[PDB]
Amino acid sequence: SLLSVPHTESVSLSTGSTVTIKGRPLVCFFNEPHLQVDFHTEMKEDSDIAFHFQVYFGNRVVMNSREFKIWKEEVESKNMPFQDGQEFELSILVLEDKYQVMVNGQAYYNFNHRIPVSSVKMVQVWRDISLTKFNVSN
Amino acid sequence: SLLSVPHTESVSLSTGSTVTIKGRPLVCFFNEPHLQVDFHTEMKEDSDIAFHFQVYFGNRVVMNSREFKIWKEEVESKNMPFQDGQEFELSILVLEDKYQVMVNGQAYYNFNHRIPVSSVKMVQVWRDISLTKFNVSN
């Protein structure tokens, strides 16, 4: 059963929380589908973003924050553990110092907190994926 | 009634053809939804692209071709006639020398042919839009 995409949910996070996302790119990597995961400070979609995580499948990853409506310093990664045409499991671990993004059980990306974790109140998952699982740990 | 997105259709184009697309961005422009329209040489999604048209809503437009699997020279435009939160009507006119992209009835983008028009056999419309109309002129 497919979940809504764009997927928008209320959340509350603290140290030790995990946000788990299972989905599949809509097209082959040759045509560069994207995935975007945004940790927002409010339910409103124009609210600030504590953690912006954008995958250009088969290419690269960009991470950033949007603070008082302004995008801040871009962080890039060339790590690309995602498999063309395959389902992926993203686990975003909320550590004391950073978000850590696991792909299929191993950490490949890290983003030190710029906005306090306790300011996060919504997560939106969108771009060119289908979604079968979105779980915030209890 | 919403059409499938990614939307993929067989087409045949010649001078005077129009490809009309009516849709709406899935999110507000502040979060930069995208639209991508690719004129392909075969039904296979990894086939060459005679006309690649990518809108970064509220930002800019990029156009290109993919020839023998290689992306060629990028063409950029800062024209941004699209309206935040509004339905748009794209009409892509196939002229003898170029594709001309109309937004709501006026031409804002042009792309001189790099691949012959008669090589185009499929069109794919995707990224962050819903779709209510896709019509190739008879």
CB contact under 8 A, A127 and B128: yes
Helical H runs in chain A?
none
| Closest CB from A6, A26, A45 relative to B6 | A26
Report d(CA A6, CA A55) in Å as an integer. Answer: 15
- Sign of the CA dihedral A127, A25, A39, A63? negative
Phi–psi pair at B43, nearest 5 degrees: -65, -30
**Cβ contact B83:B70 at 8 Å:** no
Residues of A in contact with B74 (CB under 8 A): none
Q: Sort out which chain A residues have CB atoms less than 8 A from B69's CB and list them.
A: 30
Nearest CB among A27, A38, A46 relative to B45 is that of A27
Q: Which amino acid is at A75?
A: V
Residue B25: how many other CB atoms lie within 10 Å: 25
Beta bridge partners of A40: A49, A122
**Based on the number of CB atoms within 10 Å of its own CB, is B108 exposed (0-12), middle (13-18) or buried (19 or more)?**
middle
Given a contact cutoff of 8 angstroms between Cβ atoms, the answer to whether B21 and B133 are in contact is: yes
Residue B36's H or E segment, with its range, is strand B34-40
The domain over range B7-136 is classified in CATH as 3.20.20.220: no
Beta-carbon count within 10 A of B43 CB: 13
- In chain B, domain spans: 7-136
CB atoms within 10 A of CB A84: 11
From CA B109, how far away is CA B53, in angstroms rounded? 9
Are B123 and B12 a contacting pair, CB within 8 Å? no
Residue A13 has phi, psi (to 5 degrees) of: -125, 150
How, if at all, do strands B122-127 and B60-67 pair?
A: unpaired
3-state secondary structure of B33: coil
Residue A101: CB partners within 8 Å, gap ≥ 6?
A53, A90, A91, A92, A93, A107, A108, A109, A110, A111
Among A91, A87, A100, residue whose Cα is nearest residue A129: A87
Distance CA B55, CA B61 (A): 5
Task: Provide the b/e sequence for A5-21 (b: ≥16 CB within 10 Å).
Answer: bbbbeeeebeeebebeb
Nearest alpha-carbon partner for A17 in A109, A105, A100 = A100
Interface test with B, best of A5, A28, A31, A64 (most B CBs within 10 A): A31
Q: A interface toward B at CB cutoff 8 Å?
A: 6, 26-28, 30-31, 34, 38, 45-46, 69, 126-128
Q: Which of A40, A42, A51, A62 is nearest to A124 (CA)?
A: A40
Tell me the one-letter amino acid at B9.
E
AA identity, residue B11: V
Cβ proximity of A18 and A85 under 8 Å: no
* Nearest CB partner across the interface for B45, out of A6, A28, A45: A28
DSSP assignment string, A40-65: ESSSSTTS-EEEEEEEETTTEEEEEE
Beta strand B106-112 with A106-112: parallel, antiparallel or unpaired?
A: unpaired
Contact between residue A25 and residue A128 where contact means Cβ atoms under 8 Å apart: yes
**Distance between CA atoms of B17 and B87, rounded to whole angstroms?**
23
Burial of B111 (0-12, 13-18, 19+ CB in 10 A): buried
Contact A126 B26 (CB under 8 A): yes
Distance of alpha carbon B83 from the chain centroid? 17
Tell me, what amino acid is at A71?
W
Q: Which of B90, B108, B98, B104 is nearest to B20 (CA)?
A: B90
First to last CA, chain B: 22
Can you read off the two tokens belonging to residue A67? 């603070």
Distance CA B119, CA B12 (A): 9
Which of A37, A45, A46 lies closest to A13, judged by CA? A37
Sort out which chain B residues have CB atoms less than 8 A from A38's CB and list them: 31
- The count of other CB atoms within 10 Å of the CB of residue A138 is 5
Neighbours of B23 (CB within 10 A): 21
A30: helix, strand or coil: helix
